């Protein structure tokens, strides 16, 4: 009931009762808020409401102080002071951006733009409010009850009337009952639970409604610049493998935090594990939002770092299968690999946070709260995919607004830039360099002469909203007959429904653009499916085509992105 103002830290008993996070607001800032928003309920030890029996006046602008009690204009005593006077709300110990964050529905892009351009304390308020609004929104969808169990990987379901049905993709992990978490894909719905239980008919699955904890630590700690490497001890016997990053590792020891922008295949994993070989005594915590990103870092460490000094932290509510070669849950091992949401309360000499475009300000703050380190290193690429914002429907979110780190990388630029792509054929590197990296990404490989583009709009069908283009899958099928080396290709598309149709017809392994991020394949077959804002997104486009080591076939719908592709044009 007594804390500090979320706008100027001025100690106060006042909290906004109309805010879903009930932030402490000082007399000056509380007034500026209630006089401009629909928010008029003010909370103290006792609420600011009319004390007169059966009176429902709760608006602080319509209330007055009767000695030590509160009353409306109809019930106030002769000697009373309005709670709102001279730019203040009465309380003990006696902003336009805060009003917008506190009242927005988080469905517009301008809401997220503001959540990142605001002050630091408002970035945490925006992050808490957004995350709590994302969870209260989970109470809105309808329950699915089992009607029939077809097999071990398929079932038929009954849906709740009056409440809408949620998107059937691997993104929306349902929580079933206490049989564990369960996922779905499209009347024969394919079921895939984290736990393998012979599902009983009549059982029900409901979405993961978790409670949002408050944020204390900033998204980014205040920057410090040092004259020498601080708290870290370099090697002199440094493997020629990592000699290219020595100057950047030294810059890491001479700053509190450092940003590394690394386009696809420029050596981000290599940079992260080499930093451990450069400061060999340093205790490093490797973190990322996804289990896949943390696992990718584990594969690189297995190759260069002693397997005994490594540990993979796995939480009890195990949703996906993880890295199995390190000792599990040993918080004290020199090298700790763990996802943001499972981080223990520990300290480190260096913290490395990878796949930084996928992080939210909620995640940035959590890392600063659970880990107290001498140095922080943010590795990622603002030209790659951000975390999905489930409430955002109106407008497109730009990279300088993904999180505080991406905002820094897109405005002041990154501290370090890995400029040479070692993975992709030159056709792909030249296209993405011009598309998203301002011609600064250089190709290490020559042109493979296996990068093709075909302009084919086909026919667009929709399974609810995930789009399908059967003629584009047919064009791929025709190409494969004439190109058997492409038999070993991974099929990629912006839609899971397209991928389900392509897996049945082509039999190729399948990946959405979003789930392909971080991975690499010799051959990639990409069908754009539609020319929507989703499939034409340049960050998704950049990710889609930078998955290929040898060859890529792009069946395009957008003339703009087709014309930008510096690939060999095909006909049929
Ligand atoms: O070792 C690596 N991964 O296997 C790697 C990848 C990409 C690189 C790019 C430039 C310099 C070095 C690199 N190293
Ligand atoms: Zn204040
Ligand atoms: Zn409010
Ligand atoms: Zn009253």
UniProtKB/Swiss-Prot annotation:
LRR repeats lie at residues 208-228. Residues 1-105 form the CV ZBD domain. A ribonucleoside 5'-triphosphate binds at residues 262-269. It catalyses: ATP + H2O = ADP + phosphate + H(+). It comes from the Viruses. Residues 419-572 form the (+)RNA virus helicase C-terminal domain. It is found in: Host endoplasmic reticulum-Golgi intermediate compartment. Changing residue 213 to I: In strain: Omicron/BQ.1.1. Zn(2+) 13 binds at residues 50, 55, 72, 75. Changing residue 88 to H: In strain: Iota/B.1.526. Residues 237-418 form the (+)RNA virus helicase ATP-binding domain. Changing residue 409 to I: In strain: Kappa/B.1.617.1. Zn(2+) 12 binds at residues 16, 19, 33, 39. Zn(2+) 11 binds at residues 5, 8, 26, 29. Plays a role in viral RNA synthesis. Multi-functional protein with a zinc-binding domain in N-terminus displaying RNA and DNA duplex-unwinding activities with 5' to 3' polarity. Activity of helicase is dependent on magnesium. Binds to host TBK1 and inhibits TBK1 phosphorylation; the interaction with TBK1 decreases IRF3 phosphorylation, which leads to reduced IFN-beta production. Interacts with nsp8 to form the replication-transcription complex (RTC): nsp12, nsp7, two subunits of nsp8, and up to two subunits of nsp13. Interacts with host TBK1; this interaction inhibits TBK1 phosphorylation and decreases by 75% IRF3 phosphorylation, which leads to reduced IFN-beta production. This is Helicase nsp13. It comes from Severe acute respiratory syndrome coronavirus 2. The lineage of its organism: Viruses, Riboviria, Orthornavirae, Pisuviricota, Pisoniviricetes. The chain holds residues 5325 to 5916 of 7096 of the full protein.
